[PDB]
């Protein structure tokens, strides 16, 4: 069987708990899943390569002294911008991000006409043609690849929700919590931290 | 639509992408919730401009034991609210009058209690159009357009009240105080710098 | 004029605030209510009998030590544990609890075939084929008595939600809070607690 975990994909079946009234939700959760996938991975990798929590990473790059993020990346012996130049600038990064992500979102969602000329209908979260340089979808199964991605989508969104509530409970960070739970499983869990009071009680 | 350009839409204008419109009672609830929110956000706006007390702390000034503090709080007042010598707006006094007046108005708004007026005023209609609009602004103005204006103000003010309650929970400083801090230096005074400070808990 | 209150029962009428959802919700609210009945009664009785909150009561039986719960039951002729060996140890109780409850839930919902084969159908709101040994309510106005328990379900669920929320607010316990209210409501209240700050502000 395909998708036998719990419930069924939006493409086929009905939610056990929700009515699934609106068909905008399907692609919404695809996009949300993909973003979460990149977010969870980011939180996984940053705290490994740098040791900082993902939720306090924002404090390193601020409109004054954004140079803290420079050279934080593993390997990458050259910093983001040279030391002493002070060019890692929150506003410069923010403007570059605003223009790039805003243009990408406008192209995806039809706020602006697509720059390309080859199909790419607005609102489809599986474009394929331009977004498969390797040609893995035509070689593989399209439907089961889409199901795998969905499983990853929902798994990563649930992992992100876990990351934020772990951040709120323990105030430490995802990987450090994972390592504490691995080291002493009985003595590092949610009920253990509840016995400590979650840091406020 | 042409008239409603906001992200969402008005009930009857169409259907919302998220949580589409169900029962009409939901639309009545939205309008009334808006109306009370407009009143609430305006009160939280004007009171601490007049005297500086955040709305989430203004409750405790009046207490069953002592309620003198609420008297003479309104700026510009010619005299005390009740005798200067012995202010008599006691919390119980306030309650006993207000529960009766508000309960009456509510039951008479919804018609669970027989209407006093019986002027053709039909309960369960957000726009009574009777004595409530003596100016009859709706009669001169265009009623569809004006309904859209009312709902836009409803949603804006309900969102503003949500902002007021969450700002109270994060910064516990006060709405206009948060405004003045942000206008003072928005770059270094906003939600994310308060997050860096930790919202007062972390 | 049965159920002449704010709302209506799932069988007749429609939900005033929330969309009625599905039949799955209609069967599920009752089960949540039965569990909330048991939970609220357990919190009430454990606190009257022991004096320590239901929430903190989870720290009494830890993997390292479960002997604290040995002599907590009021009016017990002897402690359940021998007091001297600490035989519970949280592991026997955990394992037998998970097997018994998991089996019971599996048989309730037909995850596994029912063993009685007494004609009972899985997923029924009120099976009653062997869940009414006394028969006092089976014979005579069954529909009304379902309304009775329905009203108790919604109450116990609301009471549990209030229990968890004011546990969060005050961190003292439900009936400690109830005694504080009853002794002098006017100076010991939710709004008084908010003005002083529940545990914060
Ligand atoms: C939507 C994407 C995104 C999300 C979810 C976050 C989320 C966060 N950022 Mg980041 N950021 C994001 C994008 C960006 N941030 C920054 C720059 C910063 C700074 C400068 C700071 C944060 C901070 C924070 C944290 C607290 C602020 C908040 O709103 O939580 C409120 C809490 C909720 C639960 C939301 C409901 C939180 C983990 C702050 C921080 O680290 O505080 C500890 C901080 O000071 N972020 C930039 C500019 C490059 C971004 C660009 O898109
Ligand atoms: C040959 C150069 C070089 C080498 C050996 C490594 C080596 C490594 N990098 Mg680095 N990196 C290098 C260049 C760069 N890295 C990064 C950005 C990153 C990221 C974003 C990540 C790594 C990660 C890793 C690890 C896999 C490993 C420690 C990954 C890791 O696991 O971090 C611990 C990871 O996620 N590197 C950039 C962009 C500025 C580079 C540019 O030159
Ligand atoms: C000579 C009389 C008189 C004068 C000049 C003022 C003048 C003022 N009052 Mg006061 N009031 C007066 C009598 C009274 N006021 C109030 C109750 C209020 C309220 C409820 C409000 C004011 C507000 C204001 C301010 C309007 C600023 C803007 O607009 C201003 C300081 C407003 C304010 O705070 O704006 C800053 C406001 O919201 N006054 C009452 C009823 C108790 C009064 C009775 O006579
Ligand atoms: C629409 C009605 C209404 C609303 C929304 C509020 C809202 C509030 N009052 Mg006010 N009040 C209201 C009517 C009245 N109050 C008072 C008199 C008081 C007093 C005496 C006190 C409050 C307090 C509070 C706060 C309670 C916060 C809380 O419980 O934790 C948060 C709850 C949530 C987030 C809900 C979920 C909040 C700002 C208390 C306070 O904050 O004191 C500083 C307090 O002590 N109010 C009277 C009678 C004269 C009212 C009459 O209708
Ligand atoms: C109590 C207030 C309230 C009520 C009853 C409604 C009701 C309605 N709105 Mg309105 N709306 C509101 C507030 C409200 N809205 C606010 C504040 C905004 C601005 C963000 C809007 C923006 C809006 C748009 C843009 C649209 C609607 C639409 C609708 C209809 C869709 C069905 C629905 O969502 O109902 C259920 C009612 C809800 C309020 C949804 C629940 C929201 C959840 C619970 C999140 C809220 C979190 C909460 C504030 C947490 C507080 C915690 C705090 C106390 C600590 C219905 C008539 C749609 C419509 O009519 O389309 C034809 C539509 O397009 N509304
Ligand atoms: C576990 C929580 C839970 C669950 C699953 C439900 C589920 C349901 N309730 Mg119940 N209810 C609950 C909590 C819950 N309620 C509590 C705590 C209260 C007390 C405030 C109520 C009071 C209540 C009323 C008053 C009504 C419902 C109704 C309903 C239906 C509405 C659909 C829905 O929300 O799903 C469904 C059977 C409605 C219904 O069955 O429609 C006729 C209805 O009229 N419920
Ligand atoms: C005081 C609360 C109360 C009341 C008066 C009833 C009353 C009734 N229930 Mg409900 N019920 C309750 C609590 C309550 N129940 C709780 C806590 C549980 C869980 C242990 C149940 C589990 C339950 C089941 C599983 C069944 C009933 C049945 C019945 C009937 C016997 C009668 C209508 C039976 C029935 O109606 O059979 C037709 C039936 O099948 N109820
Ligand atoms: C039927 C359920 C139920 C019952 C019997 C009680 C009973 C009680 N509560 Mg609890 N409570 C409930 C639901 C309930 N509450 C819910 C749903 C909430 C969350 C909104 C709370 C939050 C709450 C707090 C924070 C506090 C109490 C307190 C109290 C006691 C005094 C009443 C009071 O000041 O607050 C009554 C407030 C409510 C009933 C909330 C009503 C909100 C809905 C939306 C209306 C009393 C024992 C207080 C206490 O003992 O300390 C002095 C206290 O500090 N309760
Ligand atoms: C990497 C990085 C580094 C920096 O340090 C900081 C930083 C913040 C920038 C960060 C960047 C992160 C990013 C870009 C994140 C993007 C995240 C996103 C899009 C998250 C979405 C999260 C979604 C959630 C929770 C869903 C909850 C919904 C639930 C359970 C309902 C489930 C439900 C339904 C639907 C149907 C069933 O039948 C029944 C049930 C009830 C189960
Ligand atoms: C004035 C005063 C002074 C004293 O000092 C103190 C004091 C406390 C007494 C105080 C008194 C104030 C009072 C009485 C206030 C009354 C306030 C009221 C009625 C608030 C209502 C607040 C309503 C909210 C948040 C709604 C949230 C809903 C949201 C986002 C969903 C939005 C949604 C929908 C629906 C469908 C779309 O498709 C899209 C999306 C998903 C966005």
Residue numbers in the entry:
A (entry chain T), C (entry chain U): 33 to 233
B (entry chain S): 32 to 233
Please share text taken word for word from the publication where this structure appeared.
Interestingly, nine Lhcp subunits, including one Lhcp1 monomer with a phosphorylated amino-terminal threonine and eight Lhcp2 monomers, oligomerize into three trimers and associate with PSI on the third side between Lhca6 and PsaK. While Lhcp, Lhcb (apoproteins of LHCII), and Lhca (apoproteins of LHCI) all belong to the LHC superfamily, Lhcp proteins form a separate clade with characteristics of an ancestral state of LHC proteins instead of belonging to the clades of Lhcb or Lhca. In terms of pigment composition, OtLhcp1 and OtLhcp2 each contain 14 Chl molecules (8 Chl a, 5 Chl b, and 1 Mdp) and 7 carotenoid molecules (4 Dlt, 2 Prx, and 1 Nex).
Among the three trimers associated with OtPSI, Trimers 1 and 3 are both (Lhcp2)3 homotrimers, whereas Trimer 2 is a Lhcp1(Lhcp2)2 heterotrimer. Trimers 1 and 3 bind to PSI on the PsaO and PsaK sides, respectively, while Trimer 2 assembles with PSI on the PsaL-PsaH side through Lhcp1 subunit and interacts with Lhca6 through an Lhcp2 subunit. When the PSI core regions are aligned, O. tauri Trimer 1 appears to be rotated by 57 degrees and shifted by 16.1 Å in relation to the position of C. reinhardtii LHCII-1. In contrast, Trimer 1 appears to be poorly connected with PSI as it has Chl b molecules (Chls b608, b605, and b617 from monomer T) located at the interface with PsaO and Chl b molecules do not function as efficient bridges for EET between adjacent complexes. In the stromal layer, Chl b608T/Trimer1 faces Chl a2003PsaO, but they are separated at a relatively large Mg-Mg distance (23.9 Å).
